[PDB]
């Protein structure tokens, strides 16, 4: 039986996506310096409702996730409601799923309102690589846990005797997988060594995206969904992402030493997303409620998929696994797709995906499917540039694809957009857009 998942409520009303907005991104240690992601989330949502001009009492639930979780506020989602003028009775709680939090954040909200518990929901995500919650060593932590529970004053000095010169040094954060110890590019590099990804073609897509990227601001189409940041110093507002360098040469890309595998690696800073800071959020709210209160939804939702696979090898193939699941749930075809989009985590992993998406054998045996997913048409593939351009604010990466996709499909006929993204820990996520 065709495993199709009709995403409609008990009443049969389908799920609507009225609007959303993205905070403009800045590099690490840039205009978003010393700005907690909570503040970035606060400003965007308050403006978003102001831009949405809809009553706040309509919103019935909001969920916000965070990459690089911060200690002071465990559930930052509730903090936003307290931080903003949002009604307190709004059921705010936080989640965490790798870099696919945005995909996760909408999913649990959508199914909840698909079950019919609520009528209006808010999903969003943000991260700030400029600010780091750097902590002390584990051994020093246990000692401090011991000293506060210590009862005798003379006990503390003996309890403080165990010390080392390296104990005082704070531990820098790491990006390599906890259970694997390999960085994300390390997974891409071996796949680049596996399926064959030369740096020149890895650099070529970076040129293609960058030219598409600067042209986008040159065209200025990414204006109605991107805010202009205002900073408490109020020296000057920010309008555009600093990361996009659309005036570049492919030769310039080739003049970088490989980062991870400095011997045979075909990935550099040029063909890898850098650490950027930003925020984004999207309103999730059913078509019946939208029609009841009179709004036009910026498209709809058709289907979605999530997948977990092995972390040791082929860890960034998640969308390839998730894509047939999303397509089968959507009951659609790769041909039945106006635009196709995937998160450009690395140039090495990306080209392998299109190769593997068209790989008949792999889908035949690894997925067990009858046929391969198909060949990715570059014309509809990442029309507005991609992640090798804007940057990687982690959580906001999902929404930034969503906004452009709905607008681009709004710029065209209804059609069907495709949004997919890989994640650490062998996690895959996929989603299918209607856009009417």
């Amino acid at each position: 039986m065709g495993q199709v998942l009709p995403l409609v409520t008990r009443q049969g009303d389908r799920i609507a996506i009225v609007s959303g907005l993205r905070t403009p991104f800045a590099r690490q240690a840039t205009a978003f310096h010393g700005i907690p992601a909570v503040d970035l989330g606060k400003m965007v949502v308050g403006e978003l409702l102001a831009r949405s001009e809809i009553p706040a009492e309509v919103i019935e639930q909001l969920v916000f996730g965070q990459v690089v979780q911060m200690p002071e506020a465990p559930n930052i989602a509730r903090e936003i409601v307290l931080g903003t003028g949002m009604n307190v009775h709004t059921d705010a709680y936080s989640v965490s799923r790798a870099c696919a939090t945005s995909f996760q954040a909408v999913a649990n909200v959508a199914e909840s309102l698909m079950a019919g518990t609520i009528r209006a929901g808010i999903a969003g995500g943000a991260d700030s690589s400029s600010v780091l919650p750097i902590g002390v060593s584990k051994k020093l932590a246990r000692v401090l846990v011991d000293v506060n529970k210590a009862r005798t004053m003379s006990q503390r000095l003996k309890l403080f005797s165990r010390l080392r010169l390296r104990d005082l040094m704070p531990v820098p954060p790491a990006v390599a997988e906890y259970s694997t110890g390999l960085r994300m590019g390390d997974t891409a590099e071996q796949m680049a060594k596996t399926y064959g990804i030369t740096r020149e073609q890895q650099d070529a897509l970076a040129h293609r995206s960058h030219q598409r990227a600067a042209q986008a601001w040159s065209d200025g189409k990414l204006k109605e969904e991107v805010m202009t940041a205002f900073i408490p110093p109020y020296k000057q507002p920010l309008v555009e992402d600093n990361n996009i360098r659309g005036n570049s040469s492919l030769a310039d890309y080739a003049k970088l030493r490989p980062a991870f595998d400095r011997k045979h690696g075909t990935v550099t800073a040029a063909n890898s997303t850098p650490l950027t800071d930003g925020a984004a959020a999207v309103i999730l709210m059913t078509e019946s409620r939208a029609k009841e209160l009179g709004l036009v939804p910026l498209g709809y939702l058709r289907s979605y998929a999530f997948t977990a696979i092995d972390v040791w090898q082929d860890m960034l193939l998640g969308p390839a696994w998730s894509t047939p699941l999303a397509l089968e749930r959507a009951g659609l075809t790769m041909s039945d797709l106006t635009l196709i989009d995937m998160h450009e985590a690395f140039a090495a992993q990306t080209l392998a995906n299109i190769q593997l998406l068209g790989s008949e054998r792999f889908a035949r045996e690894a997925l067990g499917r009858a046929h391969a997913t198909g060949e990715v048409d570059d014309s509809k593939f990442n029309v507005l540039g991609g992640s090798i351009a804007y940057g990687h604010p982690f959580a906001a990466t999902g929404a930034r694809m969503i906004t452009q996709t709905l607008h681009e499909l709004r710029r065209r006929g209804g059609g069907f957009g495709l949004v997919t993204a890989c994640a650490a820990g062998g996690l895959g996520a996929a989603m299918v857009l209607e856009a009417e």
């Binding site: 831009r51 903003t84 205002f230």
Partner: protein
């Protein structure tokens, strides 16, 4: 019964008696002679059935513990003896209550003002609720009156004189946290447990341990008291200039209370209260206070208003931020700014940031409170979200065609029920409206110099203006904590209309070789704060000319300003503080002196010869022009009410309050005598001093101004 005996007593099952304070007249718990009368019956009844743990006092009203002593009966007093005896009966009654040997508790909720503190000083145990609404204060020096009943000498007895005196001289509001910190209130408890917490303290018997003062206040009487009294008196005279009574009298009554005993302070307090109750500044302040209450109680428009929840601001900048800062921080209403330049958005947001930043820099407000207050501020460059703004205010340039452009776009790009407010300075409101879909929803809000300083604004409707629009406007300004006054839609409106002659003749005299010290001292000594030239420095010489050209176009040469001075200053740009390079330069060495005067301005101005006459001659001529114009505007009734006219001049411009306002002052000056004064100056100087037609009409007949004034 309990209506007359507002101190309805109740002995609980224990040995504790509770006394309520519920005057049936109003929610304010005021003091009346009957209340002073029946309390003697109650305290005698309290003497009955003795041998109990103690007694307590409660607010018995959710708003305030006690309003204080009524002043209407004080105004009904005639001579010193009535006021002296009134103090004496208050002096004796407080000590009589203090004469009790058992523990007496004043569990106070909400406002406790005026005579309540005197009562509070009598009770041995004092406890207050934790709500921000409750406060302690002696608000009578602001009225030009001393609250002499024993507390004026018990408080310096109770607390160090370093703070007691400034409390008397500067009767203000003290937080429960502050009072407990210095020890005025014994303890602070939540309102829910306010009554019960007193019970155990009342049952606790005779805490005979008087807290010691700072030990630096022991100088009262011995060496130090005169040094303190000399320093405060000299500083006060340096501050108040001596034209305000009830300042030296405090120093006398405090000294005799401290250095000569409580009884010595008692008799002086009675005597000083008697001689001072009829001081002309006293009823001047009392009458001024009356109109302030009247306008606060005034609802403005008689029509019911409309709900107000969202407001829009067109344009931005420092001037735009002033409305934005107040609307969020004071009114707490969402506001949207539409400056096309983000810098205009950036500037206005920066201004409101700086305004709130200093508050937190003083630790006056929490950092989260700033974020909570910053949340009400929203800026953009489009009309999105403006579709549901009940009111819109322009902070844009005063181009008329642009103004009619402003009303069209806001009408096109907002709601239909919404009303519009115009912050104009020159253009008439109906002229501004001209072609408008709903001109009745267009109202004129003449704002001023930084609005957080002066709480006075002008309400300027035009031929077509819905009364509800005013009603919304009147409620909003009051909801903004401001002073709305309906001003007839006339050229110059009211304030700037009457302000022009002030600096006009001043420049005319200044052109005739007047020095900075003589012109400045003349006006400031005559109860006018901030003299003209420094006023022009701060308001800006560029704005100093304002729109006075239309004044000649509207009302002839009467507003004509002398030439070759505005020209001599506009060319060599000297705007005071707008350019910073006014004739009062800043950045002086030490920065602890008066704003220095340029020597080069005198050649720049005509400076005809040398100064002559005296400060009163300068004062008398300057003042009468406002008077000649103040009667003029009310002659055509630019202002609806005489008290409304008087309150605006005395409060907005800075007319000497001790004069009771110009209408009081002309009533104080009486009749055609002042009219006779202002023809001789006309003859000796010129025809700018022509009498007003009503001014002779009222003056010659001896007519009064404050209704039945005389």
């Amino acid at each position: 019964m309990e209506m007359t005996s507002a101190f309805t007593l109740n002995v609980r099952l224990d040995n504790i008696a509770v006394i309520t304070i519920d005057v049936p007249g109003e929610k304010m718990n005021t003091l009346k002679a009957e209340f002073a009368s029946q309390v003697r019956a109650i305290i005698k009844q309290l003497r009955e059935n003795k041998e109990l743990r103690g007694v307590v006092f409660v607010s018995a009203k959710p708003d305030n513990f006690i309003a204080g002593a009524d002043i209407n009966m004080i105004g009904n007093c005639k001579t010193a003896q009535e006021a002296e005896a009134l103090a004496r009966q208050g002096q004796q009654l407080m000590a009589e209550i203090h004469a009790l040997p058992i523990q007496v508790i004043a569990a106070i909720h909400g406002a406790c003002l005026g005579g309540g503190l005197e009562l509070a000083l009598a009770c041995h145990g004092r406890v207050c609720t934790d709500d921000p609404k409750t406060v302690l204060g002696l608000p009578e020096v602001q009225l030009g009156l001393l609250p002499g009943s024993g507390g004026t000498q018990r408080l310096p007895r109770l607390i160090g004189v370093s703070t007691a005196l400034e409390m008397i001289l500067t009767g203000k509001q003290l937080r429960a946290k502050q009072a407990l910190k210095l020890g005025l209130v014994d303890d602070v408890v939540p309102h829910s447990i306010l009554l019960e917490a007193a019970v155990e303290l009342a049952k606790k018997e005779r805490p005979s341990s008087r807290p010691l003062p700072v030990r630096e206040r022991i100088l009262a009487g011995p060496l130090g008291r005169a040094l303190l009294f000399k320093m405060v008196g000299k500083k006060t005279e340096h501050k108040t200039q001596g034209n305000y009574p009830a300042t030296e009298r405090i120093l006398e009554v405090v000294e005799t209370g401290l250095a000569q005993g409580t009884s010595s302070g008692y008799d002086a307090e009675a005597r000083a209260f008697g001689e001072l109750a009829m001081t002309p500044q006293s009823q001047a302040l009392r009458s001024i206070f009356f109109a302030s209450t009247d306008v606060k109680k005034d609802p403005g428009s008689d029509a019911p208003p409309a709900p107000l929840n969202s407001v829009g601001i067109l344009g931005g900048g420092l001037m735009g931020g002033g409305i934005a800062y107040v609307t969020a921080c004071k009114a707490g209403i969402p506001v949207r700014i539409k400056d096309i330049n983000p810098q205009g958005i950036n500037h206005a947001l920066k201004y409101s940031w700086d305004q709130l930043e200093g508050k937190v820099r003083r630790r006056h407000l929490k950092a989260s409170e700033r974020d909570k207050q910053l949340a009400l501020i929203s800026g953009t460059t489009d009309y999105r979200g403006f579709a549901h703004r009940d009111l819109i205010i322009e902070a844009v340039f005063e181009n008329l065609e642009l103004k009619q452009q402003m009303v069209a776009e806001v009408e096109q790009n907002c709601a239909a029920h919404t009303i519009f407010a115009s912050n104009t300075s020159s253009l008439p409101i109906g002229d501004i409206a001209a072609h408008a879909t709903r001109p009745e929803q267009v109202i004129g809000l003449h704002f001023f110099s930084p609005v957080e300083k002066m709480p006075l604004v002008e309400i300027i409707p035009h031929a077509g203006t819905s009364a509800q629009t005013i009603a919304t406007t009147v409620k909003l300004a009051k909801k903004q904590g401001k002073t709305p006054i309906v001003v007839r839609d006339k050229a110059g409106f009211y304030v700037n209309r009457i302000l022009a002659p002030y600096i006009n003749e001043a420049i005319r005299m200044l052109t005739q070789g007047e020095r900075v010290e003589h012109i400045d001292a003349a006006l400031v000594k005559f109860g006018f704060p901030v003299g003209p030239i420094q006023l022009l420095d701060e308001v800006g010489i560029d704005t100093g000319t304002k729109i006075i050209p239309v004044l000649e176009a509207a009302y002839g040469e009467r507003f004509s300003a002398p030439a070759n001075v505005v020209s001599s200053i506009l060319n060599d740009d000297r705007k005071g503080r707008k350019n910073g390079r006014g004739f009062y330069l800043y950045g002086q060495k030490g920065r602890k002196s008066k704003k220095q005067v340029d020597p080069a301005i005198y050649p720049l101005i005509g400076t005809q010869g040398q100064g002559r006459i005296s400060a009163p001659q300068v004062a008398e001529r300057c003042v009468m022009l406002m008077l000649n114009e103040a009667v003029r505007c009310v002659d055509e009734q630019v202002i609806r009410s005489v008290r409304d006219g008087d309150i605006g001049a005395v409060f907005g411009i800075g007319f000497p309050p001790f004069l009771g306002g110009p209408f009081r002052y002309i009533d104080s000056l009486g009749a055609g005598e002042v009219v006779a004064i202002m023809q001789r100056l006309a003859t000796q100087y010129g025809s700018r001093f022509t009498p007003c037609e009503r001014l002779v009409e009222m003056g010659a007949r001896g007519e009064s101004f404050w209704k039945t004034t005389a």
